[PDB]
């Protein structure tokens, strides 16, 4: 009803770069800088990867990056490995003092 | 020249600046009951804000005229505040000190 | 405001006359406390007034 939109699955071989899109509306994602990206392995909590479109927390190198243009944002993985197969979730500011998260994207390594 | 009709107490906002030095004006500095107008050569930037996300609600009072009031606060409650740079304000107060010390 | 009080604003409700002058409706508004004065010395602490 109100969740964000993401592609279902993106796949790629090791050594390549993988782009995941996150598309909402003008009031939610196109209004502020507040976009975050989380990575989840099965059987555990999601792991903090990207906050505020392109900034990075501790423990994350330049393997992961982000961008935003208009009503959409994007995660980029450079130098893909076998450990990067996961689910990836996009959360953002959701309008009228709310945050909203969409259905995630399954990354499978070839 | 274009005079800004700025309504403000205890400070003067968006006014004209003196050309070369801070100018201190009074009718007579001996009398205590005269407001001492200090005119700054360089301005100090002040930034003011109300952070809480108010909304506007219209109440129809009588025939065809409305009264606009505050509805809900859509978010969280924060403090309305003004910010002045500390180093520049301390420097400005020291300079107002030296051209006050010219008369004392 | 959402399960917590604000210290500056009161949630004042009052009976407005509508555009039909024999009929009235209840309305509410959030007023700043400098705009609001308690009404009198009567035995009701929940009844207030505008500062005008």
């Amino acid at each position: 009803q109100s969740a964000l939109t993401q592609p279902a699955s993106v796949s790629g071989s090791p050594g390549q770069s993988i782009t995941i899109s996150c598309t909402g509306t003008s009031y939610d994602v196109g209004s502020y800088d507040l976009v975050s990206w989380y990575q989840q392995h099965p059987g555990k909590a999601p792991k903090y990867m990207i906050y505020e479109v392109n900034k990075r927390p501790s423990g994350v190198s330049n393997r992961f990056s982000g961008s935003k243009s208009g009503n959409t944002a994007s995660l980029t993985i450079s130098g893909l490995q076998a450990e990067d197969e996961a689910d990836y979730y996009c959360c953002s500011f959701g309008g009228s003092a709310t945050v909203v998260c969409g259905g995630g994207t399954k990354v499978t390594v070839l | 020249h274009g005079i800004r009709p700025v309504v403000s107490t205890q400070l003067l906002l968006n006014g004209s600046l003196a050309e070369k030095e801070i100018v201190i004006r009074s009718e007579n500095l001996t009398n205590n009951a005269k407001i001492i107008i200090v005119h700054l050569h360089t301005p100090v930037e002040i930034v003011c804000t109300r952070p809480n996300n108010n909304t506007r609600k219209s109440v129809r009072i009588g025939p065809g005229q409305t009264f606009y009031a505050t509805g809900d606060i859509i978010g969280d409650i924060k403090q309305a505040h003004c910010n002045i740079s500390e180093e520049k304000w301390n420097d400005t107060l020291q300079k107002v000190g030296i051209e006050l010390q010219k008369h004392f | 405001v959402k399960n917590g009080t604000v210290e500056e604003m009161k949630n004042c409700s009052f009976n407005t006359t509508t555009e039909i002058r024999d009929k009235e409706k209840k309305e509410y508004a959030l007023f700043y406390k400098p705009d609001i004065v308690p009404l009198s010395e009567t035995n009701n602490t929940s009844e207030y007034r505008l500062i005008n």
Partner: nanobody
Amino acid sequence: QVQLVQSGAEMKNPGASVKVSCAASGYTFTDFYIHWVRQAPGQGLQWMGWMNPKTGRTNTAQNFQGRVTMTRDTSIGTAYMELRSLTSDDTAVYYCATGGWISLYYDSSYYPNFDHWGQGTLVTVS
């Protein structure tokens, strides 16, 4: 160092109400917002609400506004969240996470900066 401990798994009948707990450590439970999120089994994340643990102000999404209640105890540093009128949709894994920085000058509530996460509680409705 900073880690969030939740309660155990629960199973209830439909029409009941559940209380998920969340114990804080390291950051003394204040000075950070706390966000409650939900994940159905095999589905994506769903955000339910936030709590300002310093002053008790809580907010939640437009779908959940009648059914969720967030409270806290600041002496031991623990958060409680009640969900009411349980249905067969509501069986899910529930997560407690940190948020923005409580600052008294700018609204840091809607910042989706979930630093540390709990282990999640499975709430089963049958």
